[PDB]
């Protein structure tokens, strides 16, 4: 129903071969993670990755009850009271360069279709100084400006990454959707002003942690949450399903509305995300519902949706629930609920499952605990460790060991450099244990003290 097979087109190349290679650490740590299945003939699975990858799109939740509209409206009122309603569209130059609260558009990333077929890059289709598109791209943009997204095709392929061993064996490989470059430019034009503002004020008050640096913001987040009796963690991750098409409609008319300062065309842009045409080799699918991965605004949209959904679930579960009975901190599929009340998220899970949404605990368990505090929760694979008046993001051990066990040739040193800044919060003994396999074989890795100094100095 939600996945319609269109007529075939030309073959867009899809990578069937991982770029990931094992490090010296793999044989020591032996993680229950490995490169995702990219090929029909992978011996590590019995399933067909092409069938399994798209199975989530075969069914989609048609409708949502009235409570979702009510929560979206109220969440919108709180956001735009904080962020203001100056959310008009940016110019193409402004979109390319970016505003104070956001980076410029990456010129090295894929231009999308049909440019990848013709062997072109983003720098070929636009001049970055003048902000001038080539005749073909200018016509495409003007077409979209007339509310017509008819010939926008997302370049779709399998995501080359580490997955849990269970997902490898079931061929549960994630999908990447790359939109055309002019679709990305339009998207940043329409939502970039809001986004830059949204990503620069992460915290409990906004309800979002998007755009945070965990090194600094863990203290702010932690300090705001420590006064609450309880903090629960919620995971939205679900390979088998995607966002309802109805959710896009709610955001279009309750959140990203003209009354909240957005351009008239946003409704149509959001529709091009909700119902999208995707190219996967020769095959062409029309997919109803779901968020494309490669859209710059994806993680922001997912964060907002999931914030709305958890309160909707609470209203659906508890007749006497009120908006301010909890505080929410959302980041993509990860969510914290801070409250003084005792809440039963097993019951909330049952309520949300009636609307096609799955929630699980953020940790290993299969059931939600009745009691949960700040010290118990996991958020972006990190716990909250108190350090005087500060909080530090202590990353899960299995996560660190998995990251250290594989790499991409060429970028090893900068991967290890990033991991030192994650591993520092686990203490010197653990830090040295994690990097021991590398410097036993002669690799120089920054000392614990050098990286600990850097973090400490952030608050002096």
Author numbering: 1 to 460
Text from the published report:
For this, 3Dpol uses the viral protein 3B, in this context usually termed VPg (viral protein genome-linked), as a primer. These enzymes adopt a classical right hand architecture, with fingers, palm and thumb subdomains providing the correct geometrical arrangement of substrate molecules and metal ions at the polymerase active site for catalysis.
These mutations were located either at nucleotide 7115 (A7115G) or 7127 (A7127G) resulting in amino acid changes M300V and I304V in the viral RdRP, 3Dpol, respectively. Markedly higher inhibition constants were observed for the two resistant mutants (M300V, 26.9 μM; I304V, 10.3 μM) as compared to that for the wt enzyme (1.3 μM). The apo structures of the EMCV M300V and I304V polymerase mutants were obtained using the same crystallization conditions as for the wt enzyme, yielding two different types of crystals for the mutants. The M300V mutant crystallized in the space group I4122 form with one 3Dpol molecule in the asymmetric unit (a.u.) and diffracted to 2.2 Å resolution. The main differences were concentrated in helix α10, which contains the mutated residues, and in the preceding loop B. The side chains of residues 300 and 304 participate in a large hydrophobic cluster linking α10 with helices α2 (Y75), α6 (F194, A195, F199), α7 (I210) and α8 (L241, F255 and F256), included in the inner fingers. The substitutions of the methionine and isoleucine side chains by the shorter valine in the mutants imply a weakening of these hydrophobic interactions. This could result in an increased flexibility of α10, including the disruption of the last helical turn, and of the B-loop, which appears to have a key role in GPC-N114 binding in EMCV 3Dpol. In addition, the substitution with valine may disrupt the interaction of residue 300 with the compound.
